[PDB]
Structure formats: structure tokens, C-alpha cells
């Protein structure tokens with residue numbers, strides 16, 4: 001029954017992974033003990049995608065929790081829903097990665113990886129028909145970045161015919177001052193380009209700017225940043241968790257969204273944007289929903305969608321609304337904004353509508369775009385990487401772990417190639 | 432196609448063992 | 459038959475590099491020849 | 497309360513907001529969750545005028561965070577030469593040591609900022625200073641940086 005295995009690695013991966021489970025649990029009527037208490041049958045129809053049914057009619061997330069930082073286990077277990085997670089699915093080390101990709105990928109991470117693979121093997125074999133995997137992690141640290149990409153690679157060896165999907169948090173010096181974050185992110189992107197089928201680019205630069213400029217928060221905290229992350233993750237997974245026709249599984253989503261294998265980095269967006277504690281006085285109209293979710297101020301990646309073209313788009317509308325009005329509005333943005341949509345992929349914008357809205361909203365909309373403007377995110381990381389790399393800055397922290405400088409050169413070149421490929425398709429014409 | 436992908440992934444594994452051995456040479 | 463023999467000899471080579479690497483874990487070259495008659 | 501506001505403005509490069517907070521009596525040595533003062537933040541982010549204003553208003557030039565890093569260590573680590581020069585001209589300790597035994601010279605050499613390594617050395621930085629890993633600053637830059645001979649002998 002199309003099961004997904006969820007994996008959360010590192011401090012960021014576990015923080016956003018926990019919020020994902022707290023949020024989707026509420027939507028499905030599942031309390032922290034695993035009991036169901038809802039009104040709608042749509043809540044449990046596809047509960048199997050993310051939850052295992054344990055004895056006593058309980059539901060337990062098909063989630064594996066990983067971190068080299070031992071202290072992460074306590075913070076996850078102490079969360080509102082820490083009780084729901086399978087105890088044996090918590091795999092924690094004693095020595096962290098110290099913001100070092102090489103430690104997470106090659107040394108401390110490699111020491112712990114077989115313990116994680118044992119637990120993913122067990123969840124995977126228990127599946128009636130496994131779809132693939134979903135990894136939440138950051139790219140700026142050491143565990144989520146290095147060990148997360150090591151896990152992806154090992155999982156790909158045993159399950160090569162399954163979808164590998166990630167929620168990858170991109171670093172921004174606006175939220176983190178760690179000097180080596182561009183190194184860790186470039187090394188991770190190199191891995192993601194080769195080994196994932198679809199990746200959602202949750203950019204800390206866009207999240208900080210949404211909180212500061214749009215939500216008017218003088219100093220956004222990780223809670224503020226993560227409110228946007230969970231709201232995004234709920235929206236982008238709605239099609240997988242509820243009964244529907246379009247993009248109902250990770251494979252059908254990838255066939256619709258990815259025309260060229262490497263070009264699988266999605267720009268997520270949502271509407272209405274809200275802060276924690278902001279009440280909704282009235283529901284947005286379908287034209288407000290459609291206009292806002294396509295707005296650059298609503299994107300979760302710091303890229304201007306009007307600086308590129310949309311290869312493909314998935315629009316998900318949640319709540320009770322007119323489908324005729326939705327269709328009209330979706331045709332309206334494409335006909336009015338025709339120059340930001342590739343003309344050589346006919347009917348590249350697919351729209352789904354789910355009757356169940358998210359918490360505190362009567363109407364909402366989530367956007368998923370595969371845009372050539374995503375090169376703005378990669379160019380920003382590449383520039384930061386190059387500034388340090390030309391000075392051979394901080395390399396001993398990586399080569400001291402056994403790494404070769406040639407790996408940095410290879411990763412830089414691969415990400416720069418990815419950027420040229422987006423530009424090639426942006427300039428392509430339907431001759 | 433799957434065998435080519437596996438060969439590529441297994442070469443990453445040989446490389447990882449080389450990295451681990453290289454660290455050992457230093458300390 | 460000759461390919462099997464060569465494969466066996468080439469495994470001795472891989473082994474020799476492992477031995478050399480093992481010494482390194484624990485802890486350029488002059489070649490002398492005499493003067494020619496000519 | 498004004499200490500939190502002063503730290504946000506120092507990090508965000510708001511020159512006029514810092515000037516206003518200073519006039520309204522904010523604590524120059526207010527610390528963030530990591531023991532960093534507004535001077536550490538302006539040094540990390542490279543806001544020279546904010547550094548000059550903070551120093552002029554009595555900020556501790558050798559203030560250390562919970563990791564033992566002074567504004568000089570962070571100016572060196574983040575490659576801000578002018579800030580390093582201002583801090584030095586204002587009494588910064590060139591031989592300041594952090595939890596790892598790194599001095600500002602160690603961080604400048606790791607960052608690949610040879611111009612900062614030079615100004616630190618001209619201000620008296622110890623070239624033999626070793627970190628807790630037994631490494632000098634130049635050992636770090638070297639670490640970062642990454643046949644047969646036929647001899648005819650008469651008999």
C-alpha cells in the first residue's frame with residue numbers, strides 16, 4: 001500500500017522531522033500515544049503511507065531518527081510527540097560531527113551507518129509495497145549533510161528501484177555564522193545531484209527573509225523558521241497522504257516534475273504565509289490563493305521565479321473551494337505570465353485539490369516548481385564556496401578526516417555544471 | 432542500467448575505505 | 459590459462475601494495491652502476 | 497532590555513540604530529546566548545563603523561565568548577583586515593587564546609588571509625604559538641595547502 005520510510009538526520013533534520021510528525025499527526029487525528037480521534041474517514045484512508053498499524057489499533061510513524069550528537073535523542077523524546085516514535089528506530093552516536101561533512105560522511109557517520117541501515121532494512125521489508133524514502137536534513141552542518149548523504153548512497157545500493165526524496169535545508173549566513181557551511185552544502189549538493197530523485201530546497205535565506213520582511217519578526221528564531229518548514233512539508237505531501245488523482249505517489253510526482261534526471265531541485269511555495277500566533281479572520285479567495293502561492297515573497301528558496309522559466313509545476317489547493325474557479329485562476333497565471341513557462345513542455349502545470357485544509361486555515365495552497373531560476377540558490381552557494389576554496393581555507397578539517405582536495409574540486413565542478421544545465425533549458429526554444 | 436548504477440555506488444564504497452585508511456596514516 | 463596465471467600474479471601485486479601501506483601505518487632512490495669502457 | 501536590541505543592530509549593520517541605542521544607554525558589553533558582545537558580532541559581520549563606534553563608547557576590545565574567542569579572533573577568522581587593524585590600534589591582545597588554543601594568527605592562517613597574518617605579526621603575534629593539537633599557525637596553512645637516480649661510480 002505505497003509506504004514511505006522517513007529518515008531524519010542531524011540537529012536540523014530531527015528538528016524539522018519532529019515538527020513534520022507533530023503537524024501531519026494532527027491532520028490525521030493521531031495523538032502522541034498513536035490513537036486515532038477524528039471526524040473524517042479521509043484521515044485514515046491513506047494513513048498507511050506514513051504510519052504502521054501496531055497491535056491495539058495504534059499508529060506508529062515509519063520514521064528513523066538519527067544523530068551523531070547524543071543529546072538529540074533527549075530533545076526528540078521530550079517533544080510533544082516523542083512518545084509516538086518506535087524506540088528501536090532511534091539510532092544515536094556519542095561523538096557529534098562538529099559541523100564537518102567529512103566526519104559525518106566518512107568517519108563518525110560511517111561508524112554508525114550500519115546501525116541505521118539495519119533499522120531502515122526492517123521498516124522497508126515490513127512494507128507491502130515500498131514507494132521510497134524521505135530524508136529531512138540540513139546541508140550546512142556535519143551529520144545531516146555528510147551522514148544524510150552517506151545514508152542516501154547506502155540506501156540506493158539496496159533499494160535502487162525506489163524513489164529517494166529529500167527535504168534539504170540550505171544554509172544562509174543570515175541564520176548561521178559557521179564558516180564552513182558553503183563547503184558542507186557543496187559536498188552535499190554533489191551527492192544529491194547524483195543520488196536523489198527529487199529534492200525540496202528549503203532555503204534558510206528565504207525563510208529568514210519571509211520572517212523578517214513579510215511576517216515582521218525583528219529576530220526570527222528557529223521556531224519561526226520551522227513554522228514555515230512544517231507548513232511547507234504538510235502541503236508538499238498532501239497528495240501522498242490523502243485520496244487523489246494527481247501526483248499521488250513519489251514516482252508519479254517525479255514523472256510529472258523531472259524532465260531531466262539532474263534537474264530535480266524543487267522550489268516550494270505556500271499561501272497564505274503566516275506566523276505562529278497569527279489568527280485568520282477570513283479565508284482567502286481562489287484568486288488571492290493563486291496569486292500569492294506563485295509570488296516570489298511566498299517561495300521557500302531564495303530565487304526570483306521571474307529570473308528563470310518553469311519546467312514543471314504542481315499546485316495543491318486545500319480546503320473546500322470551487323474547482324471551476326481554481327481551473328480558471330490556474331489558466332489565468334499561465335496565460336498572463338506565459339514568458340516564465342517553458343513552451344516545449346505542453347501542459348506542464350498540474351493542479352490537485354484536497355478537501356482537507358491544514359490547521360487554522362479554511363483555504364490554503366502549496367506550490368512546487370521545478371524552475372531554472374533555482375540556479376540563483378546554487379550560484380550563491382558556489383560563490384561562497386569559491387571565496388574560501390581559492391584560499392584553501394579550513395581544508396585541514398576535511399583532509400584530516402582522510403578526504404582528498406580533489407573531491408572539493410569535483411563537487412564544485414558538478415554544481416557549476418548543474419547551473420549551466422538550468423541555463424541551457426532556460427534559453428531553449430520550441431524552434 | 433541497474434548494474435551500472437550499482438557499480439558506480441560500489442566505487443564510492445571503495446573510495447570511502449581509501450579515505451578511512453588515509454586518516455589512519457595521519458592519526 | 460595464461461589469463462588465469464596473470465590474474466594470480468596481479469593479486470600478488472595488490473597484496474604487495476597492502477604490505478607497503480601496512481608498514482606506513484607503523485612508521486629519491488639511488489641506483490649505482492660502474493663506469494663504462496667505451 | 498537594550499542589550500538584546502544593541503546585539504541585533506550590531507549584527508544587522510544598522511549604523512544609525514547603534515548610535516541611537518548608545519545614546520539611550522545600552523550596555524556595550526551585553527552578551528548573546530554564546531557570550532558574544534556587539535563587538536564580536538560587528539567583527540564577524542564586518543561592520544567597521546559599528547566597531548569604531550562600539551570602541552569609542554567603551555566596549556571591551558578583548559571580551560571573550562564561551563569559546564574563548566575575542567573580537568580579534570573573529571575579525572581574523574572572517575577575514576576583515578580593517579577591523580583587525582582597528583582592534584589592534586585599540587589594544588587588542590595578539591596572543592589571546594581560545595578553548596582550542598587558537599590565537600588570532602591561527603585563525604587568520606586557517607582562513608587563508610595572509611594580509612591579516614602579516615598585520616598580526618607586525619603587532620607582535622607569536623609565530624611559535626601552538627594550539628591544543630600541537631600545531632602552529634603556519635602548520636595549519638601548510639596542512640590546508642595539501643623517483644630513481646642513476647649514479648655512475650668509478651671502481
Ligand SMILES: Nc1nc2c(ncn2[C@@H]2O[C@H](COP(=O)(O)OP(=O)(O)O)[C@@H](O)[C@H]2O)c(=O)[nH]1
Pocket residue numbers: 009010011012013015016069097098099100138139140141142143144145169170171172175176181204207222225226229
Ligand atoms: N531551518 C532550520 N535550520 C536549522 C535548524 N537547526 C539547524 N539548522 C541549520 O542547519 C545548519 C547546521 O546543521 P545542523 O543540523 O545544526 O547540524 P548537524 O547536527 O551536524 O546535522 C545551519 O545552516 C543551521 O542554520 C532548524 O531547526 N531549522
